[PDB]
Design a protein around this ligand. Sequence first.
Ligand SMILES: Nc1ncnc2c1ncn2[C@@H]1O[C@H](COP(=O)(O)OP(=O)(O)O)[C@@H](O)[C@H]1O
Ligand SMILES: Nc1ncnc2c1ncn2[C@@H]1O[C@H](COP(=O)(O)OP(=O)(O)O)[C@@H](O)[C@H]1O
Ligand SMILES: [Mg+2]
Lengths: 576, 571
Amino acid sequence: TWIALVPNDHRARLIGFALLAFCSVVARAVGTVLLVPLMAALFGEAPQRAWLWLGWLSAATVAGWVLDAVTARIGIELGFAVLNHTQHDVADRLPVVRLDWFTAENTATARQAIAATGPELVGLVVNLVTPLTSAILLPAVIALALLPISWQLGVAALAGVPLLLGALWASAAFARRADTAADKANTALTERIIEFARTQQALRAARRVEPARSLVGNALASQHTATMRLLGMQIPGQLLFSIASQLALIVLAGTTAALTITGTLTVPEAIALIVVMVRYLEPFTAVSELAPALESTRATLGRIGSVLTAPVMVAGSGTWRDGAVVPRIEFDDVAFGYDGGSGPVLDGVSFCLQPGTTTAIVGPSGCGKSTILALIAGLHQPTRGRVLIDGTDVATLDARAQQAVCSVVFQHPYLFHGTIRDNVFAADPGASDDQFAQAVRLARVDELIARLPDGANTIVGEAGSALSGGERQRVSIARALLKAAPVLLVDEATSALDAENEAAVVDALAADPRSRTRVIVAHRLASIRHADRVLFVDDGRVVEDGSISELLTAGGRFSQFWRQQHEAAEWQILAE
Amino acid sequence: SWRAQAASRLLAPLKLPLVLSGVLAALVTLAQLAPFVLLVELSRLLVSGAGAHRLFTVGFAAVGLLGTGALLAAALTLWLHVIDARFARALRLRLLSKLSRLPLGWFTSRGSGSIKKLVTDDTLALHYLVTHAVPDAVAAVVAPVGVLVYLFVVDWRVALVLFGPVLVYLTITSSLTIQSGPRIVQAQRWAEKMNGEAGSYLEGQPVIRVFGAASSSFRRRLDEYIGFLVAWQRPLAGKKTLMDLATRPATFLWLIAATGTLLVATHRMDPVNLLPFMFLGTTFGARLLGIAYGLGGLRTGLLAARHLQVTLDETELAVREHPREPLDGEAPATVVFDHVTFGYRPGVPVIQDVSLTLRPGTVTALVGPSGSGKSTLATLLARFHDVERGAIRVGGQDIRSLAADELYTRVGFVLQEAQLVHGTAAENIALAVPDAPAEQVQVAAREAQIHDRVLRLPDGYDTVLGANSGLSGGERQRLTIARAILGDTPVLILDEATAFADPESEYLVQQALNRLTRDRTVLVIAHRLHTITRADQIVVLDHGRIVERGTHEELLAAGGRYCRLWDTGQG
Ligand SMILES: Nc1ncnc2c1ncn2[C@@H]1O[C@H](COP(=O)(O)OP(=O)(O)O)[C@@H](O)[C@H]1O
Ligand SMILES: Nc1ncnc2c1ncn2[C@@H]1O[C@H](COP(=O)(O)OP(=O)(O)O)[C@@H](O)[C@H]1O
Ligand SMILES: [Mg+2]
């Protein structure tokens, strides 16, 4: 629905541009009506009395020139305006799009809609709106002006306009349908090749390359079955309009000839009317020449349409009186399945945590273990349940204030294109360099900022930038410690062959003045040993919500995990 | 570029269908244009006598022209689609046959998105080219030429006085194009950069939603982008509108009317000989714009065909070079290296003269700073790229002198990229041996610590896999380890990073590996060098060539770089 909206507050400029385009159209129309007497004079016995009509046509021409020049200027202005407005609107409405919408391709869609639509819009205004609308409106006003001169031939054009427009649109629709059928069939064909090329290593290694190759080739040679519908439904897309136009021309010329042979309008008038008929038929071809541009713009703006018409998550309504100095994160009877790629992951879990007490989450991989740290941060919405941070729901919060309760250490770190100092200063922009120094010292990363050229300020965003794995994970840890919020969620990042990252995690766990409630999903015994209330989550449900000293010597699956970790860190490939 | 250039001219086998289609499209366009000449003839008749019979004749002629035009257009479309389908089928077969022969290294050099892009995108672009661009461009170039010839045949003076707007348009557009040199490449660079900005902003969405003050950078970049676009476009707007004014049919109409009125009033025009200009004279401005449009349009298909051909004319494997007649070192699994030097580019060489020999039943390891040719060597061992100098033999028999079947019959490897071929999970474990009797598969899956999970699968040993299979990284790695166990090839390659890939499911993968490497010539790419302490031969290498090899205890009792890597945290 909402695809390209002008500011929509200053109606004056819009209505003025509209009436100006209409004036340019009516001038271009009165052009041919002035052609009529000129051509009528150019054939009679006295062709010397056409200079008056030539002067009048020149007047109409210069009027049209001024009008459409002003129209083009206004068009370019409105194009800049709409580009600015809609780009700001698109980039403004993507902290609110529900997170499970960013699928594998919905992300590429938004990327294209963001970084490919500048020139498309600045041309969309003028090059699309003004020619398309003017050329459509022109035949109608031509007919209306042709009614006084010859009534029986004026109404013919008014009958013609709808038929020709319908023919044009039907041809466009046929073309589009044939094209989508074509490339869909092409994808159906050349998907097996992509599949055989993706798994080309395992096949080659298992000595199964020639049978798979022969099978795919046999399938290719077998299906065939093209043409008929494809060719049949691809043909009409141009013949329809070509026929329709030539037929309308034939009919109009025949009508004029019949009316000048029965003695209702002398020979000179018929010629002028024949000329005016070609003038009337030209704008339809002018429009038909705008099919591919219109289709390209339609796709480009469908990108923005899909972006803006995406689902949005809202909490609002205002809460958070004081700040809940040390909250208590409980959430009972909660289920959250991923809309898109469904499956009831994390169905019906319940646990009341405590304020200022580390609560380590440990479980098998891919068991809905980061979804819990998302739902606790309020980054997701539970389908049937309620997160109860400090005895109040989290969906009853003004979004600006519900992000000031948590601070996450996300698994895959992300450093935007800037400098290390600016990344670390993204948490609290209004901080002092002493707090920053304390954090950059507590995150075991001072050696990293002093192990690089030119100091702290360093282009870090992307392209390696000398940052590798744990090196940027420690920057993320330093950033998540700056934002003063009474919750610290630390989802462990894989940092093998690097002990500094683990030491920094232990430091963030033990030495911290803030005294905040923390939740640390981790696996390594060192990280897991500094908690006092461990949860064992197996397939979307807590299993062993006890504590270390009592989970070891009493129950199961955790002596299992414990011995597996203790004897998996001494596995050396023996020469056997 | 030019003709007979066999790096962009792969579309040579259809040059004759293409020229016949060009001729047919020219005929179609002339048939489209003819109705105006018929109208002029009708007017010439009507202006003097021309009883009803003579006008009916012109009507019949117009009907005939319409019919033959429609028929020719239909024939052209059918013929183009037929030849395009045939050529596309041939191209698909050729591309697949080629893809079945490129060296494995190429695949883990391009990736996955590039493969799909190339195949489907370029096939579709070339098909669209052949079916639309060529005939449309032929029409767009043949229509103005014909109109111009017909105009000069009728009256050579009105065409001359009509050239004016074309001349001023060329003047202004030349001025603009020479007056916009910097800004176009600057905007291209801006677009290429803003693409990365958008990618990063979309990637780091949770970080934006938690730390809301980290969005500032992207918003400032976008503001600078739109400001640059405005400051670029806004200035050259008056020039653009003044140059777009001399295309309007109103201008050509005024010119034609003025010159015709001047010539007729002086009785030197024969006014009936002015109608051709009135009919097919105003759109002459748009005709040249269409020329430029189509001739520019036939560019994406051309560059796509060029890229596809430079992919097709690749360099496949030198394989089967005059068998080496296996030597007398030892031919069980004794793999021996030599003066091996190899580089990805023809310039910088990554590997230099390693020459290390493994024994049958030995476990060798590679240790270097990450990014020092540590994996490239083992990768070469499995024939991912040919060496530039020196030999590599498996049993004293040069690998290049080995059929792709016989080679991997004895050089099975387990790298990263599990690479599950979607099918029957049981058959996916038994990919190596075609038909295992349903018990070997089960015992291998039980001895690879995956049996319990594959039974926990919805159905069992029949489940077709896929993106939504549910298997985790560790689970897929254990399936591939089971497949390699069933393979039973007495030379192995371990990328140790496969172990600590899924940090939770790691003990099970360690057990699977300890079962997989019970009797081999394992070559371990060791990342965490504590796991290699009982290995028979350690080999440290940095920036290419080897520096020193030996056993752990000795190499530690002889200080260089290894006591260094050892004291680092591990002591
Ligand atoms: N964006 C997504 N769309 C669909 N399924 C998802 C998505 N993200 C995660 N999942 C699935 O949800 C489950 C929970 O995964 P998660 O808790 O993130 O695992 P981990 O413990 O490795 O962090 C898994 O089956 C995972 O594949
Ligand atoms: N696909 C590639 N294209 C070009 N150069 C590459 C490619 N992959 C690796 N290299 C380069 O080859 C060299 C060897 O790297 P590699 O053997 O992967 O290191 P390591 O084993 O220490 O991880 C490095 O300089 C690396 O940047
Ligand atoms: Mg996780």
